[PDB]
Write a protein that binds this ligand. Structure first.
Ligand SMILES: [Cu+2]
Length: 99
């Protein structure tokens, strides 16, 4: 699945923001507008036994140009909350269910 970071109008949203994937399906986050953006998983809101540090972007790594991507693959079934660090207070948060 591909997820855009920001609407074209600069709206601070993942598109789509709540979605489902199969275990082992790749998630392509594509930087769109309103950046900088990144993708960090909330370690309190992902399945047991998953280390959020392996699937989250590095804290200083921000996507700052159109079309840059971050790709991640999730295998443990369950629901995962993630967010964009700079825009988390503005509502830029999303959820992926892995089945
Ligand atoms: Cu952002």
């Amino acid at each position: 699945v591909e997820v855009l970071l920001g609407g074209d109008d600069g709206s601070l949203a993942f598109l789509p923001g709540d979605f489902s994937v199969a275990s082992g399906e790749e998630i392509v986050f594509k930087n769109n507008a309103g950046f900088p953006h990144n993708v960090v998983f909330d370690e309190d809101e992902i399945p047991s036994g998953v280390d959020a540090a392996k699937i989250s972007m590095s804290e200083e790594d921000l996507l700052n140009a159109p079309g840059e991507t971050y790709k991640v693959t999730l295998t443990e079934k369950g629901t995962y909350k993630f967010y964009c660090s700079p825009h988390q207070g503005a509502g830029m948060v999303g959820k992926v269910t892995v089945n």
